[PDB]
Design a protein around this ligand. Structure first.
Ligand SMILES: COc1ccc2c(c1)OCC/C=C/CCCCN(C[C@@H](O)[C@H](Cc1ccccc1)NC(=O)O[C@H]1CO[C@H]3OCC[C@H]31)S2(=O)=O
Ligand code: NA
Ligand code: NA
Lengths: 99, 99
C-alpha cells in the first residue's frame, strides 16, 4: 500500500502466534515489542531513545508477519510504550519513504 | 526521491539559515530538534518516548526546509539524541511510506 502520514502508521503484525498492533517506524533501527515470550535464546541489550535507555531481551531469527508480509530478523522485547517495526524488518517488506 | 531503509533516512534541513541533519521519522508524531534559538513565543510540552518523558519547548509556525522542501509548522526543541522530522512536517513535504 501507500500509507499517508496524517495519522500514525499502525499495522497488524503476527509474532509468536499473537496478533499485535505496531507502528511502522523509519526512525527506529530496531524492532521493539512489548513484553511477551518468544522461543529460543536471548541476550540482554540496552537501547536508547528520546527519553533515555531501556533494557530489552534480544531474540534473533524470529519470523514475523507485518501487514501480511512475512519476514525474519531480530526482535527486541521490553518496556516500549508502543510496539514498533524498525528498519531491520521494514527493509524486508520492501518499505520505502517517498516524496 | 525514493528512500530505502538500509541506512538511517538522514536528510539535511535548514532552520534559521543554518543546516542541520535530521531523521525522517514516521514513528514520531511531532518534529523534535536539539537545543537552538528560535523566534517567537514557546510553551513547554512533555513528550513520551522509549526511556520515558522529556520536556520540550513548542514553537509554532516555524519556517523549516527539509530535503529542499519548504515547510512552516511546529518544532519542538529539547534534549533529543537525534534531530527528528515527525509526521507533522512529513505530511507538509508530501511523504508517504510505500510497500
Ligand atoms: C509526539 O512526537 C513524538 C516525537 C518523537 C517520538 C514520539 C513522539 O514517540 C511517541 C510515543 C511512541 C513511542 C514508541 C517508539 C519511539 C517513538 N519515537 C520516534 C522513534 O523513531 C525514535 C527516534 C529516535 C532516534 C534516535 C534516538 C532517539 C529517538 N527511535 C527510537 O526510539 O528507536 C529506538 C529503536 O531503534 C533504535 O534506533 C534508534 C534508537 C532506538 S520518539 O522519538 O519517542
Ligand atoms: Na533465536
Ligand atoms: Na511561533
Amino acid at each position: 500500500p501507500q500509507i499517508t502520514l496524517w495519522k500514525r502508521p499502525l499495522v497488524t503484525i503476527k509474532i509468536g502466534g499473537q496478533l499485535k498492533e505496531a507502528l511502522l517506524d523509519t526512525g527506529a533501527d530496531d524492532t521493539v515489542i512489548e513484553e511477551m515470550s518468544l522461543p529460543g535464546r536471548w541476550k540482554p541489550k540496552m537501547i536508547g531513545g528520546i527519553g533515555g535507555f531501556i533494557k530489552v531481551r534480544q531474540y534473533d531469527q524470529i519470523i514475523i508477519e507485518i501487514a501480511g508480509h512475512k519476514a525474519i530478523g531480530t526482535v527486541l522485547v521490553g518496556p516500549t510504550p508502543v510496539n514498533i517495526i524498525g528498519r531491520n524488518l521494514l527493509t524486508q517488506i520492501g518499505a520505502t519513504l517517498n516524496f
